[PDB]
Design a protein around this motif. Structure first.
Motif, PDB file in Angstrom:
ATOM      1  N   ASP C  11       0.832  -1.190   0.000  1.00 10.33           N
ATOM      2  CA  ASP C  11       0.000   0.000   0.000  1.00 10.33           C
ATOM      3  C   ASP C  11       0.871   1.247   0.000  1.00 10.33           C
ATOM      4  OD1 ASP C  11      -2.052   1.839   0.208  1.00 10.33           O
ATOM      5  OD2 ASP C  11      -2.312   1.542   2.367  1.00 10.33           O
ATOM      6  N   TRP C  12       0.490   2.222  -0.824  1.00  8.93           N
ATOM      7  CA  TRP C  12       1.227   3.478  -0.932  1.00  8.93           C
ATOM      8  C   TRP C  12       0.896   4.384   0.257  1.00  8.93           C
ATOM      9  CZ3 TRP C  12      -1.217   1.813  -5.695  1.00  8.93           C
ATOM     10  CH2 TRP C  12      -2.606   1.980  -5.681  1.00  8.93           C
ATOM     11  N   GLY C  14      -0.814   6.280   2.769  1.00  9.88           N
ATOM     12  CA  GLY C  14      -2.153   6.832   2.773  1.00  9.88           C
ATOM     13  C   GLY C  14      -2.386   7.754   1.598  1.00  9.88           C
ATOM     14  N   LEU C  15      -1.874   7.361   0.428  1.00 11.85           N
ATOM     15  CA  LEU C  15      -1.868   8.190  -0.782  1.00 11.85           C
ATOM     16  C   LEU C  15      -1.437   9.621  -0.456  1.00 11.85           C
ATOM     17  CD1 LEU C  15      -5.297   9.461  -1.987  1.00 11.85           C
ATOM     18  CD2 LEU C  15      -5.364   7.620  -0.300  1.00 11.85           C
ATOM     19  N   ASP C  16      -0.324   9.721   0.267  1.00 15.45           N
ATOM     20  CA  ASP C  16       0.164  11.000   0.760  1.00 15.45           C
ATOM     21  C   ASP C  16       0.526  11.926  -0.395  1.00 15.45           C
ATOM     22  OD1 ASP C  16       2.992   9.981   0.102  1.00 15.45           O
ATOM     23  OD2 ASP C  16       2.395   8.636   1.730  1.00 15.45           O
ATOM     24  N   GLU C  17       0.638  13.214  -0.076  1.00  8.70           N
ATOM     25  CA  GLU C  17       1.001  14.200  -1.083  1.00  8.70           C
ATOM     26  C   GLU C  17       2.377  13.887  -1.655  1.00  8.70           C
ATOM     27  OE1 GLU C  17      -0.467  16.608  -2.635  1.00  8.70           O
ATOM     28  OE2 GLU C  17       1.331  17.312  -3.678  1.00  8.70           O
ATOM     29  N   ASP C  18       2.462  13.889  -2.979  1.00  6.75           N
ATOM     30  CA  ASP C  18       3.688  13.555  -3.686  1.00  6.75           C
ATOM     31  C   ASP C  18       4.591  14.784  -3.762  1.00  6.75           C
ATOM     32  OD1 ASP C  18       2.737  15.056  -6.094  1.00  6.75           O
ATOM     33  OD2 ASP C  18       1.237  13.450  -6.058  1.00  6.75           O
ATOM     34  N   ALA C  21       3.140  16.022  -8.352  1.00  8.07           N
ATOM     35  CA  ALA C  21       1.963  15.525  -9.068  1.00  8.07           C
ATOM     36  C   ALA C  21       1.879  16.151 -10.454  1.00  8.07           C
ATOM     37  CB  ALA C  21       0.673  15.769  -8.280  1.00  8.07           C
TER      38      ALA C  21
END
Lengths: 378, 52, 50
Positions: C11-12, C14-18, C21
């Protein structure tokens, strides 16, 4: 409407080495502020720079007064009457961009423009919101809205009139740039438009021509750019207006690399303060360097490093390091020799490059056909 | 204005500047307009010589 | 189609800020460090006469 990038990139977002954090540019931004009083540029100004000074709210008082008065005027003109289509409502949202975009934000203006778009029928309103929010998302780093609006305009909106979207490739100056889009497409529509500008809202003609030259000479190194960017009439005229850009272009074209590098340094620096700075100033000055190096290496079989340094500016060791870095990256086909101090070009002939490309494309197709065959018939 | 000799002078000057800016096609267009507007007016031998 | 659950589907978070983007396909050379241009040029030729 809102032309001078609101000075905000050059404002206190170019600190450190560029150092641009306080100067007359802050004055220009603040005069553009006080006229049509705005608080939206004051968000970050309420946080880091001029956080809680007296003027921060001493302007806010009559700013809020003025915006409340004008919003009240718009609401009265909207509720009292029932004007349809392109109407006083569109006036309310265009103000709301002249306002809350420059009071607080685009979000309310985006919503209002969506509503009036549902209410309106003609197309310039949609292009208006496209450029409004392209510049807003250059203020707040938005691209998905720009591409959505561009698709809406080009695919569907551009079935009546035409002649408008072309310059809205300005986003394509910074979308896929560091690989393919700081050029190619961004140059093939700048070139297609340089004769007929008619979009002075975004940028003056001189700035447009500088952008066109910059993106064209990286899109086209010498693939007969002259047929469109040197023999070009309007570009030549504006270059007569702009000595620095003209020198920078003709130095590359006329193989005057010694001055081409000084022009490229000037371009890098003046490019480091722009909407075009943050995206690819590093990338552009790497690509132009590689382009000039490949231009010199072409029409040569073996070049002394001394000849390169004396004819390409300076730095025998500097040129050695740069050639090493660029060959290591796979570009700039050439092999550099040490203290013998020779650089040998290893550009394959047409037959060998053809064979290599055959191998590559056929390997791609063979992997695809293998996968396809195996998923079928189990 | 009905005056055309001064109009031809102005058009020729515009073509001259346009040529001096390397804006050759637009200079040619301005010159063609000047020639058209001069093929209907006195065009003294100086103006004819200058135009040629 | 196998979902390959034998390998834990990492799993990535918590789909955190990259980082950005962005749409910005870049290369390996964009991450180095540089110090403008003109500085280099003068700094390497004033030793010989500039």
């Amino acid at each position: 409407p809102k032309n001078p990038d609101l000075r905000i990139a050059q404002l206190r977002f170019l600190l450190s080495l560029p150092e641009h954090r306080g100067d007359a540019a802050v004055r220009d931004e603040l005069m553009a502020a006080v006229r049509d009083n705005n608080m939206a540029p004051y968000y970050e100004a309420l946080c880091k720079s001029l956080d809680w000074q007296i003027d921060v709210d001493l302007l806010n008082k009559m700013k809020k007064a003025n915006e409340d008065e004008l919003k009240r005027l718009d609401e009265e003109l909207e509720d009292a009457e029932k004007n349809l289509g392109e109407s006083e409502i569109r006036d309310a949202m265009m103000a709301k961009a002249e306002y809350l975009c420059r009071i607080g934000d685009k979000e309310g203006a985006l919503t209002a423009f969506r509503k009036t778009y549902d209410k309106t029928v003609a197309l310039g309103h949609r292009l208006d919101i496209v450029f409004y929010l392209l510049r807003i998302g250059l203020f707040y780093m938005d691209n998905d809205l720009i591409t959505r609006n561009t698709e809406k305009a080009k695919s569907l909106i551009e079935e009546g009139g035409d002649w408008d979207r072309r310059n809205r490739l300005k986003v394509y100056q910074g979308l896929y740039c560091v690989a393919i889009r700081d050029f190619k497409q961004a140059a093939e529509l700048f070139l297609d438009t340089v004769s007929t500008f008619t979009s002075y809202e975004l940028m003056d003609y001189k700035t447009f021509v500088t952008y066109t030259v910059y993106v064209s000479m990286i899109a086209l190194e010498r693939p007969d750019l002259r047929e469109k960017v040197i023999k070009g009439a309007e570009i030549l005229e504006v270059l007569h207006s702009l000595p620095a850009v003209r020198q920078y272009l003709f130095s590359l074209y006329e193989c005057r690399y010694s001055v081409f590098f000084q022009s490229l340094a000037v371009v890098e620096q003046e490019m480091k303060k722009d909407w075009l700075f943050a995206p690819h100033y590093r990338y552009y000055v790497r690509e132009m360097r590689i382009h000039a190096y490949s231009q010199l290496l072409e029409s040569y079989r073996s070049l002394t490093l001394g000849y390169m340094a004396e004819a390409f500016g300076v730095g025998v060791e500097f040129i050695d390091q740069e050639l090493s870095r660029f060959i290591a990256a796979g570009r700039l086909h050439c092999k550099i020799d040490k203290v013998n101090e020779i650089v040998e070009t290893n550009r394959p002939d047409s037959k060998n490059w053809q064979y290599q490309e055959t191998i590559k494309k056929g390997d791609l197709l063979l992997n695809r056909v293998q996968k396809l065959s195996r998923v079928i018939n189990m | 204005m009905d005056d055309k000799a001064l109009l031809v002078e102005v058009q020729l000057l515009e073509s001259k500047t346009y040529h001096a800016l390397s804006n050759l096609p637009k200079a040619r267009a301005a010159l063609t307009s000047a020639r058209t507007t001069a093929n209907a007016i006195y065009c003294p031998p100086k103006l004819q010589a200058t135009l040629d | 189609d196998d979902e390959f659950e034998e390998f834990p589907a990492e799993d990535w978070a918590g789909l955190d800020e990259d980082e950005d983007a962005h749409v910005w396909e870049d290369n390996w050379d964009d991450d180095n460090v540089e110090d403008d241009f003109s500085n280099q040029l003068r700094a390497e030729l004033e030793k010989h006469g500039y």
